[PDB]
Short mmCIF file of C-alpha atoms in Angstrom, two decimals:
data_model
loop_
_atom_site.label_atom_id
_atom_site.label_comp_id
_atom_site.label_asym_id
_atom_site.label_seq_id
_atom_site.Cartn_x
_atom_site.Cartn_y
_atom_site.Cartn_z
CA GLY A 1 -86.44 103.85 -105.34
CA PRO A 2 -89.16 101.36 -104.57
CA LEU A 3 -88.22 97.77 -105.70
CA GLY A 4 -89.74 94.10 -105.81
CA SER A 5 -90.65 90.84 -108.22
CA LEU A 6 -93.42 89.88 -109.91
CA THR A 7 -94.81 86.68 -108.44
CA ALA A 8 -97.88 84.51 -107.06
CA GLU A 9 -98.46 80.89 -105.95
CA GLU A 10 -100.53 79.34 -103.44
CA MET A 11 -101.27 76.20 -101.82
CA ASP A 12 -104.36 75.60 -99.53
CA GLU A 13 -107.93 76.85 -100.38
CA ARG A 14 -109.27 79.61 -97.78
CA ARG A 15 -106.66 78.49 -95.20
CA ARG A 16 -105.21 75.73 -92.83
CA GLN A 17 -106.38 76.83 -89.45
CA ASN A 18 -109.06 78.89 -87.58
CA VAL A 19 -106.92 80.09 -84.78
CA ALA A 20 -104.48 81.12 -86.49
CA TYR A 21 -105.73 82.50 -89.64
CA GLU A 22 -107.67 84.49 -87.10
CA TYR A 23 -104.35 85.79 -85.59
CA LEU A 24 -102.84 86.89 -88.47
CA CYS A 25 -105.81 88.07 -90.09
CA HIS A 26 -106.24 90.34 -86.98
CA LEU A 27 -103.04 92.54 -86.74
CA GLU A 28 -103.70 93.06 -90.70
CA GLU A 29 -106.58 94.99 -89.02
CA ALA A 30 -105.06 96.33 -85.94
CA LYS A 31 -102.54 98.28 -88.52
CA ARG A 32 -105.54 99.20 -90.91
CA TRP A 33 -107.36 101.06 -87.76
CA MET A 34 -104.19 102.60 -86.69
CA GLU A 35 -103.13 103.95 -89.75
CA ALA A 36 -106.68 104.73 -91.17
CA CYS A 37 -106.95 108.06 -88.33
CA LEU A 38 -103.13 108.77 -88.08
CA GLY A 39 -102.02 108.08 -91.71
CA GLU A 40 -98.45 107.01 -92.73
CA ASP A 41 -96.89 104.10 -94.29
CA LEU A 42 -97.01 101.38 -91.95
CA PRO A 43 -94.95 97.57 -92.27
CA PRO A 44 -96.34 94.52 -93.04
CA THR A 45 -98.04 91.66 -90.92
CA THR A 46 -95.11 89.89 -91.05
CA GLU A 47 -93.09 92.53 -89.60
CA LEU A 48 -96.04 94.18 -87.60
CA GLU A 49 -94.66 92.36 -84.40
CA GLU A 50 -91.60 93.99 -85.12
CA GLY A 51 -92.75 97.41 -85.40
CA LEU A 52 -94.98 97.21 -82.63
CA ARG A 53 -92.48 95.64 -79.90
CA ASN A 54 -90.59 99.06 -80.37
CA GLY A 55 -91.95 102.20 -77.86
CA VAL A 56 -91.95 104.19 -80.89
CA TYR A 57 -95.11 102.91 -81.69
CA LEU A 58 -95.79 102.47 -78.13
CA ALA A 59 -96.13 106.33 -77.93
CA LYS A 60 -97.59 107.49 -81.00
CA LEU A 61 -100.55 105.29 -79.64
CA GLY A 62 -100.47 106.69 -76.23
CA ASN A 63 -99.88 109.88 -77.98
CA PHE A 64 -102.47 110.26 -80.77
CA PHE A 65 -105.32 110.42 -78.14
CA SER A 66 -103.54 111.41 -74.80
CA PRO A 67 -99.89 113.12 -75.62
CA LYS A 68 -100.41 114.94 -72.50
CA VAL A 69 -100.21 111.74 -70.16
CA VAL A 70 -96.85 110.65 -72.18
CA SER A 71 -93.76 112.55 -72.18
CA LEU A 72 -93.04 114.82 -75.61
CA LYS A 73 -90.33 113.66 -77.90
CA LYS A 74 -90.21 110.56 -76.25
CA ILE A 75 -89.62 108.94 -79.68
CA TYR A 76 -85.93 108.74 -80.92
CA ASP A 77 -86.42 111.28 -83.58
CA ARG A 78 -89.64 108.96 -85.11
CA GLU A 79 -87.22 107.17 -87.09
CA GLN A 80 -86.19 104.06 -85.75
CA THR A 81 -82.97 104.35 -87.99
CA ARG A 82 -81.08 102.86 -85.20
CA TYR A 83 -83.49 100.05 -84.43
CA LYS A 84 -83.56 98.43 -88.02
CA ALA A 85 -79.91 98.55 -87.28
CA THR A 86 -79.06 95.90 -84.37
CA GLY A 87 -82.13 96.05 -82.75
CA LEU A 88 -83.39 97.70 -79.32
CA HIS A 89 -80.68 99.38 -77.33
CA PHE A 90 -82.57 98.94 -73.82
CA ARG A 91 -83.91 102.78 -74.65
CA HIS A 92 -86.97 102.37 -76.66
CA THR A 93 -88.69 100.20 -74.18
CA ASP A 94 -88.77 103.56 -72.62
CA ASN A 95 -91.46 104.60 -74.62
CA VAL A 96 -93.45 101.88 -73.83
CA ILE A 97 -93.89 102.13 -70.03
CA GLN A 98 -95.76 105.53 -71.05
CA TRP A 99 -98.64 104.04 -73.24
CA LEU A 100 -98.62 101.82 -69.74
CA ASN A 101 -99.28 105.06 -67.65
CA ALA A 102 -101.11 106.36 -70.47
CA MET A 103 -104.27 103.83 -68.79
CA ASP A 104 -104.09 105.95 -65.78
CA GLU A 105 -106.20 108.60 -68.08
CA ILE A 106 -109.45 107.12 -67.15
CA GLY A 107 -108.44 104.48 -64.94
CA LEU A 108 -108.43 101.43 -66.41
CA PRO A 109 -108.56 97.93 -64.83
CA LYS A 110 -105.47 95.50 -64.22
CA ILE A 111 -107.00 93.47 -67.14
CA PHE A 112 -105.48 95.88 -69.31
CA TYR A 113 -102.01 96.77 -67.96
CA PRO A 114 -99.41 94.51 -69.78
CA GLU A 115 -95.99 94.80 -68.79
CA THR A 116 -92.96 95.48 -70.58
CA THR A 117 -91.66 91.93 -70.06
CA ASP A 118 -93.71 91.21 -73.19
CA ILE A 119 -93.55 94.28 -75.13
CA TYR A 120 -89.32 92.75 -74.92
CA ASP A 121 -90.13 89.51 -76.56
CA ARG A 122 -89.16 89.23 -79.81
CA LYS A 123 -91.46 85.73 -79.72
CA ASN A 124 -94.31 86.10 -78.23
CA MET A 125 -97.12 89.41 -77.28
CA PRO A 126 -100.18 88.55 -77.33
CA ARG A 127 -101.01 91.31 -74.71
CA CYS A 128 -99.83 93.91 -76.95
CA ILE A 129 -102.20 93.27 -79.67
CA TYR A 130 -104.81 92.39 -77.39
CA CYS A 131 -104.92 95.67 -75.54
CA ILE A 132 -104.52 97.52 -78.84
CA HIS A 133 -107.77 96.46 -79.71
CA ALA A 134 -109.29 97.42 -76.83
CA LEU A 135 -107.87 100.52 -77.11
CA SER A 136 -110.82 101.02 -79.88
CA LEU A 137 -113.40 101.02 -77.31
CA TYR A 138 -111.54 102.90 -74.67
CA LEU A 139 -111.12 106.12 -76.32
CA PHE A 140 -115.25 105.59 -77.49
CA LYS A 141 -116.19 105.58 -74.18
CA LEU A 142 -114.91 109.18 -73.07
CA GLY A 143 -114.89 110.46 -76.48
CA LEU A 144 -116.37 109.53 -80.29
CA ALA A 145 -112.93 107.54 -81.76
CA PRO A 146 -113.76 105.12 -84.40
CA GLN A 147 -114.41 101.38 -83.66
CA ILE A 148 -112.85 98.52 -85.32
CA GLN A 149 -114.53 96.72 -88.00
CA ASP A 150 -114.48 93.04 -88.18
CA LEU A 151 -113.67 91.28 -91.30
CA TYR A 152 -110.90 88.62 -90.27
CA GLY A 153 -110.46 86.29 -93.13
CA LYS A 154 -110.14 88.47 -96.55
CA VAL A 155 -106.56 88.48 -96.57
CA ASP A 156 -104.96 85.15 -96.91
CA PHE A 157 -101.25 83.91 -95.21
CA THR A 158 -98.30 81.47 -95.87
CA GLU A 159 -98.49 77.91 -94.19
CA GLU A 160 -95.32 78.06 -92.59
CA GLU A 161 -96.73 81.33 -90.80
CA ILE A 162 -100.11 80.17 -89.71
CA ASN A 163 -98.89 76.73 -89.08
CA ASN A 164 -95.93 78.32 -86.70
CA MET A 165 -98.49 80.64 -85.13
CA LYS A 166 -101.13 77.88 -83.43
CA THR A 167 -97.66 76.18 -82.62
CA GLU A 168 -96.30 79.45 -80.78
CA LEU A 169 -99.67 79.22 -78.83
CA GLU A 170 -99.46 76.01 -77.94
CA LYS A 171 -96.98 75.46 -75.64
CA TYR A 172 -96.06 79.06 -74.83
CA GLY A 173 -99.80 79.22 -73.75
CA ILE A 174 -101.03 82.46 -75.30
CA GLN A 175 -103.68 83.67 -73.91
CA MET A 176 -106.63 84.25 -76.43
CA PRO A 177 -109.26 86.00 -74.86
CA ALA A 178 -112.53 86.97 -76.81
CA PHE A 179 -112.38 90.07 -78.74
CA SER A 180 -116.14 90.33 -78.71
CA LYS A 181 -116.41 90.60 -74.97
CA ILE A 182 -113.44 93.18 -74.46
CA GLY A 183 -115.25 95.74 -73.09
CA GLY A 184 -117.27 93.74 -70.35
CA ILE A 185 -114.88 94.45 -67.36
CA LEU A 186 -114.56 98.49 -67.64
CA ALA A 187 -118.09 98.75 -68.64
CA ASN A 188 -119.16 97.20 -65.42
CA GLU A 189 -116.92 98.64 -62.83
CA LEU A 190 -116.75 102.54 -63.92
#
């Protein structure tokens, strides 16, 4: 059975940083929209990056709408048991490559062509989240898929995480594009 404790406490009022708090908050949404249509107990925000890095989620997303472009039974029994054990065995990444090919379904530009080098990095992977956000309008373009809503700022976070966020994107130079203007390239060059 499940477990847990009973505690609650905070420091700041609303948040510490705007850019950082925006990043974390975004993740909380990316999972809400994904499960909103799919329907499955997904991991938390602090572990989200740990669940997305796995190709298992890369194929599941690239198969939920385009199960053709993506091979079948690519996922490792969709259990990710061996993963939690130690981590990636240079086999899960395979599912990632497929997801990248899914773009060929419509012929998206290069701006939406994330590399595996970023997906196989348990420290930085903005192109991953960002891309997942654009996928919303993508399907909504050649289909009638739902559109992600914007309401970041309803779920607070820790001080060590938020502060660490802006930090990781202060030296590594994490490209922070405008989520408001994502479908501006593919729209021009159809």
